[PDB]
Amino acid sequence: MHRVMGIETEYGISVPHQPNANAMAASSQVVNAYAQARWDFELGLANVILTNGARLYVDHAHPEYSTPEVTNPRDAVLWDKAGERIMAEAARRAADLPMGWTIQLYKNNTDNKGASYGCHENYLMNRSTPFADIVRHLIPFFVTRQVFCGAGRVGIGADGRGEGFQLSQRADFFEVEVGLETTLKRPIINTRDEPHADPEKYRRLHVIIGDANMSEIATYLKLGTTALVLAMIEDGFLSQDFSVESPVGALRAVSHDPTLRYQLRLHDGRRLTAVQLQMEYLEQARKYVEDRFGTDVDDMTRDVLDRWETTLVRLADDPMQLSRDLDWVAKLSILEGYRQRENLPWSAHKLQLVDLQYHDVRPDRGLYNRLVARGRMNLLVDEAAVRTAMHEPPNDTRAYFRGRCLAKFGAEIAAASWDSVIFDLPGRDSLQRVPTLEPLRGTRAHVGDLLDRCRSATELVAALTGGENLYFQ
């Protein structure tokens, strides 16, 4: 499987019993206590590039981790999980700062009181794909993919005043079909197009509707199935009309029915549950891959299709058999256990606590992490590779050059961003901006041996000068 992608996650942040604290200061402590060089923008909040090519920064009063660019959903899972470990370690380091704050971080999307914060997916696409096709084929997919992407939420309505359990944290915060907003009146399809790459070639699709997931299976499916649907849209393969009546209303109705029986009303007259509509996308994805590649499918594409179908089949049969794979099911299984054991109504405060603490990044206190520790969750990657991904970049995108430069020549890196690395060489009047405009250049295959040989940043900039249209574009 091959599509440039990345994940940004804004973390919930709590600093109890510290009247001096505010969210901006706490978020800064997290970013600053972990680490490197500063962000090249080409009020400046704390903002750092890590040696794995990721961005760690304060955004909207939350600490945010944005993965390096990766090429496939398994790598998306791996470097996104490295982000969780980085957050947990950052908070631990922040506790040793002079202020001494105990900072709690949550990989979730809401405080259940009316505030929401974002987990964004980014996908590189052909600029030539017409946006009206992107919108009309992705809205029904995004309305329904929460049946396996949802992280679960206790409380109904943006303000949480309705009693009950729902599939997704984000659904109640979405209000329109298409638009620019990310913090209010949120659109199912966000239209911002900032590829940090050649805008004549590329669109960057900025997806904001998904819940942050703990489960590696859920994140894998979220990114992998979306990438398969994007390939279909780019190629004009989808001839059916999947559009639904009142898609914002349907997003909320789907989330609010965890029995998975609510029926969407399609414009073409069909009436399908969210699981049924997802099965229609999966069947077209299978046909697309068969038509294009035959049995010559790469193993990851086959695995995404197989897991997508197996998940939808089990969801239609009995969703609780997925308690080792999906976040909302794993969470619901704990919630229903307490409801049974203690005769709790859905408004009980203990259920709100389980809903939130499921996403605590601490290995010893977060409930998802406790499930993993007891062997109650299926994993996609192993912990040794996660630890390696905290400090090493992917080999097959420009994040390789970015992260390895910081690791090897960090003292001489003035700044970096997704599309540049800026060197401060000793004796040089000026800064040297090395543009990294192509996401699939600056990889290990392009610069790994060069970086190996160079013993100084001055040697590297000498080797790279006049060679920008070789190494990076």
């Binding site: 964004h120 990310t182 704990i334």
Partner: peptide, 28 residues
């Protein structure tokens, strides 16, 4: 079951205070 005892071991103290105090700034 056994897993509800593991969860019980780690749940935040002062549950109602914790939930009421978990108030976030809006993000994206």
């Amino acid at each position: 079951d056994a897993i509800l005892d593991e969860i019980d071991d780690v749940l935040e103290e002062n549950a109602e205070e914790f939930v009421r105090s978990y108030i976030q700034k809006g993000g994206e």
